[PDB]
Structures are given as structure tokens and as C-alpha cells.
Amino acid sequence: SMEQVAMELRLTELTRLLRSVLDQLQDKDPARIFAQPVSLKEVPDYLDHIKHPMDFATMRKRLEAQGYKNLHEFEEDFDLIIDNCMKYNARDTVFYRAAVRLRDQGGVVLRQARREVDSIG
């Protein structure tokens, strides 16, 4: 149906916007602390601590399969990256501090993405 096609075009346009949002967020992590999944080889206890691991590579895989239906979904995954880190790591660590800076800086980006996703529909 043409209605199905049109919905698919909206999903594609969302995916384009989310790809640029994701690049912008990841630039706020120049140390690449959140680039890849936490390794279970190197933190074998991780899943006892953190129930839903998340990282930028995993988000990118989801995005390229057009797996985010809306910005809420995408923000949920971004928040997991930050929130997981601030629970697993202590306040006085380079990891926790990188999460705080990513949150603060990413908040600016997401504030306008929300307007762009609404605005362009």
C-alpha cells in the first residue's frame, strides 16, 4: 500500500536524523569509553550488576536496521549507557566522570533533536 510506503519514508527520515544525533553524541565521548560493549571476558561479573548493557556500537547496529521507531526509544538506549556506568563505577573514576560529561553535553543535543523530530514530523 501507499500508506505503508509513506510510513516507511518517515522511518527512513527518522533514521537519518538519529544517525546525525548519534554522531554528535559520540563526539562527546572522545575517550571512546562508551564505544563498545563492556567485555565479559574482562568484567566477567558485569551482568550480575547491570541487567541491560548498552554502548554506541550496539545503538548503531539497531539504527542501521531502522530499529528505532521514535526518539523516545533512542533516548532510552542513550540513557542506559550513562545510567549503567554511573551505577557500576564509583564517583571518583574516569568512567563515571566521562558519563557525567556525556550526559551534560548530550542533553543540549537531545533538546534540539526533540524539536527537530516534532517539527519535521
Here the CATH number for the domain that contains residue 2 is 1.20.920.10
Q: Based on the number of CB atoms within 10 Å of its own CB, is 115 exposed (0-12), middle (13-18) or buried (19 or more)? A: exposed
Domain residues for the domain of 81 are 1-121
Q: What is the resolution of this structure in A?
A: 1.8
**How was this model experimentally determined?**
X-ray
Count of C-beta atoms within a 10 Å radius of residue 6:
10
Tell me how many degrees the CA angle 15-102-24 measures, rounded to the nearest 5.
Answer: 35
Tell me how many degrees the CA angle 50-56-60 measures, rounded to the nearest 5.
Answer: 125
Residue-by-residue DSSP string for 54-110:
--HHHHHHHHHTT--SSHHHHHHHHHHHHHHHHHHS-TTSHHHHHHHHHHHHHHHHH
Name the domain count of the chain. 1
Q: After which residues is the chain broken (C to N over 2.5 A)?
A: none
Residue count of the chain, please give it.
121
17 CB-near residues (< 8 Å, 6+ apart): 113, 116, 117, 120
